[PDB]
């Protein structure tokens, strides 16, 4: 009853939290593989030494050289590790487009895919879906973990609406006027979670929410007009399902990713002590407010891309990555991230064709990146 | 397929709401029996005329003299109607001690029992539990209904805590000094057309919550030390379950008893359009604060009684019935209600024996009422 776990992106936030869950629960889990990029070698060496796992992939060839003895090195190291390691669960916590091929490799093996890497579902679309058995993909993000728990509240035909919650970002309440003046560091701190410069920016622009709506449709098969977003500044309620009789079932916990991680690794079984529970011996308040879809149209823009289907969500994602890098570099303003997403989706006519192979997906992203660059060039 | 329903207590708040749900859903339910006390004989005869159901019971023989074609009249009329009617669901929405035998009769038929009658579990306890098969009893109360929905979020083994919500009453936040000046009218006592004087008062005193804690223990088999109460003034979250991993699942809806009534009737199948869903288009907040157990000790007393066991919860409730009536009759002050419950309970250890018959329960109750009357009068 012990699950063999491959951890991809082991040195990041999710990767390290997942290793602590596995360390705490040797009854339930064992690490059998680690993959990293090569940029934090001290962490990875520390992880090799602490877990005793030598079955390691490192993307950067130079960093893998620097370390020596690494059995998998290069841009396909993570994919090859997954292909050649027997495991029950593959945790994909890699960042960006490079999570796609290791996602596809993992699905092919039969292992449960515990998915933090959103880009692989968002961009992979039906390519990833065709490769997956029912229930094989288990979401790691707290919103989707919340949804999966809440769906147990009824049969599938009893689902009326999925309700995703959003923190609302640092600029909740701000008008369009004052969104123009946002600096790369004003969008650099998140109220409840501590994440990377990209992932914290995606919370500020509401594109992380947009992307999660896409993932929600792809994970659970609920239509886009039945997936709602509500602003909940506290991030204690992580999501809800409303049923056909009027009942809403909600999931709540203090923000700690170890909870959704442990549940994604152990699914369907809950992992005793994974995280602290809500304390009802002290006063608290859960506030909800409607999202401002005029100032923050990134979610509706994600529905539009999602309804168009095929490779259009790959376009929505890839356009974001490029426009976001331009923001962090200092080349474009804050509102220009979503404005450029809009302009790129409007030109992306051809990319509504369903992908047959990874290259179709790769072809759409290439186009979107270029088109996104051309839009940046114009300002 | 269609469920045949017997409605006991048809002329009350729950019973009439249940008949509305049955009338809006002829596909799901048909009424096959109706039982009332006699005080609202006119309502029952209009119900007979409206539904076409002639299979009716009237407890009051004197009131039954007015009609001449009631197949079941007198004492145990409701019990006899239960024994002699083929049904799939018995809704027991009878008030007080006269709900206990129809509950037992209903369990013996092997029909599902939708239980609103509090005395069945609070007084009848082990008599009712030993007579019931697993899943046979489905609760009608909004809190218990919330708990049953939330328990879907994991296995029985995965439960850490049940958390009942409480409005806190009209004297939420009041000091012990504040409570000294409490009048019957302040405690929500008005000549309301369906609201019994007791249930408003039991909510103001926190005895309703005590009673619900006792029933939670018996319905769900969770230790008293793992059943909590949080104050929640909005009454949108109707109760919650905390699981062993630290995740809490909560049930939420705008107050409307037709939701938990519909689900109780159709269990485990939800009833489309039963009640309005939470609306997140407009801002709101769900507030939680701990209960001040020094000013409001009624729930800890309920746990004391329930742990003591046997007929002690019967004593708890009868001692309340008497004390609460005396406060309404201006013979005692508000704080003396729960004060008097403590004193009767402290002197009551002889009733910690398990009841063998309905009579054992009646004897305990008789004792508790007399002992409480003593305390009221100064004897
Ligand atoms: N943290 C959170 O709570 C949330 C996470 N997510 C999602 O989780 C995913 C993971 O990001 P997060 O853990 O949060 O990330 P981090 O940025 O903290 O870490 C990402 C990991 O990917 C590795 N990596 C980077 N480049 C490569 C590459 N060239 N080849 C192989 N591995 C590489 C990194 O290794 P190294 O740095 O050593 O090079 C690192 O271990 C994201 O897609 C994000 O959308 C979603 C919602 C919130």
């Amino acid at each position: 009853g012990r699950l063999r776990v491959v951890v991809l992106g082991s040195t990041g936030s999710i990767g390290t939290q997942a290793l602590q869950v596995i360390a705490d629960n040797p009854d339930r889990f064992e690490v059998v593989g680690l993959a990293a990029g090569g940029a934090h070698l001290d962490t990875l060496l520390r992880q090799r030494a602490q877990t005793g796992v030598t079955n390691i992939a490192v993307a950067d060839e130079h960093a893998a050289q620097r370390v020596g003895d690494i059995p998998y090195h290069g841009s396909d190291a993570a994919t090859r590790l997954v292909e050649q390691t027997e495991a029950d669960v593959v945790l994909n916590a890699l960042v960006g487009a490079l999570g796609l091929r290791p996602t596809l490799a993992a699905l092919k093996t039969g292992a449960r895919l515990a998915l933090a890497n959103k880009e692989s579902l968002v961009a992979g679309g039906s390519l990833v879906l065709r490769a997956a058995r029912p229930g094989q993909i288990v979401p790691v993000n707290s919103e989707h973990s919340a949804l999966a728990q809440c769906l147990r509240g009824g049969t599938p035909d009893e689902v009326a609406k999925l309700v995703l919650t959003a923190s609302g970002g640092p600029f909740r309440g701000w008008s369009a006027a004052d969104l123009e003046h946002v600096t790369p560091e004003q969008a650099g701190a998140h109220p409840t979670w501590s994440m990377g410069p990209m992932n914290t920016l995606n919370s500020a622009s509401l594109v992380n929410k947009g992307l999660q709506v896409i993932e929600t449709h792809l994970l659970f098969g609920i239509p886009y007009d039945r997936i709602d977003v509500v602003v909940h500044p506290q991030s204690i309620i992580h999501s809800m399902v409303t049923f056909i009789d009027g009942s809403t079932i909600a999931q709540a916990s203090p923000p700690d990713m170890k909870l959704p991680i442990s549940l994604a690794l152990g699914w369907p079984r809950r992992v005793s002590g994974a995280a602290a529970a809500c304390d009802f011996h002290t006063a608290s308040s859960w506030e909800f407010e409607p999202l401002d879809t005029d100032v923050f149209p990134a979610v509706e823009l994600a529905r539009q891309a999602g309804v168009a289907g095929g490779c259009m969500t790959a376009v929505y994602n890839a356009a974001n990555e490029e426009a976001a890098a331009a923001f962090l570099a200092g080349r474009i303003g804050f509102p220009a991230i979503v404005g450029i997403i809009a302009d790129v989706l409007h030109a992306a006519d051809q990319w509504a064709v369903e992908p047959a192979t990874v290259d179709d997906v790769l072809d759409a992203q290439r186009w979107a990146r270029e088109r996104a660059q051309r839009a940046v060039s114009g300002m």
Side-chain angles (χ1 to χ4, degrees), chain A residues 123-147:
Chain A
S126 61
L127 217 204
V128 170
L129 282 185
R130 268 190 291 281
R133 298 140 199 74
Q136 205 188 356
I137 308 188
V138 181
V140 164
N141 293 17
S142 39
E143 293 80 354
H144 304 113
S145 175
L147 288 177

Side-chain angles (χ1 to χ4, degrees), chain A residues 221-265:
Chain A
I222 295 293
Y224 284 104
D225 65 3
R226 285 203 275 149
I227 304 160
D228 295 324
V229 175
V230 70
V231 175
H232 169 56
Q234 285 78 35
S235 305
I236 291 158
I237 298 278
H238 303 288
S239 273
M240 334 180 221
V241 176
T242 296
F243 296 88
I244 55 173
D245 59 354
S247 193
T248 294
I249 300 299
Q251 189 275 330
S253 63
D256 185 341
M257 282 302 289
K258 277 179 197 178
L259 176 63
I261 289 160
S262 64
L263 186 46
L265 300 174

Side-chain angles (χ1 to χ4, degrees), chain A residues 9 11-14 37-40 59 93-94 98 116 118-119 141 195 199:
Chain A
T11 60
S13 175
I14 300 295
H40 300 100
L94 300 161
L98 59 82
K118 35 162 56 73
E119 308 82 343
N141 293 17
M195 301 167 296
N199 224 250

Side-chain angles (χ1 to χ4, degrees), chain A residues 14-317:
Chain A
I14 300 295
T16 52
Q17 293 180 82
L19 289 185
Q20 290 168 35
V21 171
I22 297 162
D24 291 341
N25 296 282
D27 26 290
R28 290 279 294 270
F29 313 113
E30 66 173 311
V31 187
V32 290
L34 301 171
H40 300 100
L41 289 179
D42 41 34
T43 324
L44 178 67
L45 296 191
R46 193 169 65 238
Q47 295 176 358
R48 177 167 74 182
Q50 285 174 343
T51 59
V53 166
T54 61
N55 190 29
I56 299 177
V58 174
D60 192 314
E61 281 277 17
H62 191 30
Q65 197 80 57
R66 204 137 49 94
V67 169
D69 215 348
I70 294 304
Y72 305 100
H73 47 264
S75 65
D76 64 9
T79 314
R80 281 189 288 120
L81 181 90
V82 172
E83 293 173 336
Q84 290 164 22
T85 311
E86 274 201 287
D88 305 299
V89 186
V90 181
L91 180 71
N92 193 351
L94 300 161
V95 82
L98 59 82
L100 181 60
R101 286 181 177 279
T103 275
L104 288 169
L107 291 173
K108 281 189 181 188
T109 66
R112 156 160 69 252
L113 182 55
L115 198 53
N117 182 256
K118 35 162 56 73
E119 308 82 343
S120 64
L121 248 194
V122 170
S126 61
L127 217 204
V128 170
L129 282 185
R130 268 190 291 281
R133 298 140 199 74
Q136 205 188 356
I137 308 188
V138 181
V140 164
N141 293 17
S142 39
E143 293 80 354
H144 304 113
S145 175
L147 288 177
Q149 297 176 64
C150 294
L151 282 155
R152 293 167 163 184
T155 61
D157 74 297
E158 289 178 338
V159 179
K161 263 160 176 283
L162 306 185
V163 184
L164 273 87
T165 50
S167 71
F171 320 116
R172 170 176 61 88
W174 292 37
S175 82
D178 27 326
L179 267 192
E180 315 195 80
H181 315 282
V182 168
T183 70
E185 272 148 55
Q186 283 195 258
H190 194 78
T192 37
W193 309 87
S194 314
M195 301 167 296
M198 257 295 294
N199 224 250
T200 187
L201 170 62
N202 283 1
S203 286
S205 66
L206 268 286
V207 171
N208 190 57
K209 212 46 63 190
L211 299 166
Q212 285 172 177
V213 170
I214 298 169
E215 302 176 270
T216 301
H217 168 76
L218 299 168
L219 283 165
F220 305 108
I222 295 293
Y224 284 104
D225 65 3
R226 285 203 275 149
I227 304 160
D228 295 324
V229 175
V230 70
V231 175
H232 169 56
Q234 285 78 35
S235 305
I236 291 158
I237 298 278
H238 303 288
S239 273
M240 334 180 221
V241 176
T242 296
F243 296 88
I244 55 173
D245 59 354
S247 193
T248 294
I249 300 299
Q251 189 275 330
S253 63
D256 185 341
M257 282 302 289
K258 277 179 197 178
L259 176 63
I261 289 160
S262 64
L263 186 46
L265 300 174
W267 193 272
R269 286 166 63 199
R270 296 182 179 278
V271 173
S272 192
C278 284
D279 189 333
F280 301 110
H281 302 138
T282 200
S284 66
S285 161
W286 303 345
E287 287 154 38
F288 300 91
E289 57 179 59
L291 174 73
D292 193 339
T293 49
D294 293 322
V295 185
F296 295 94
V299 171
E300 181 56 40
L301 223 47
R303 291 179 214 272
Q304 291 171 3
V307 161
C311 299
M312 288 287 338
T313 54
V315 174
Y316 173 95
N317 183 37

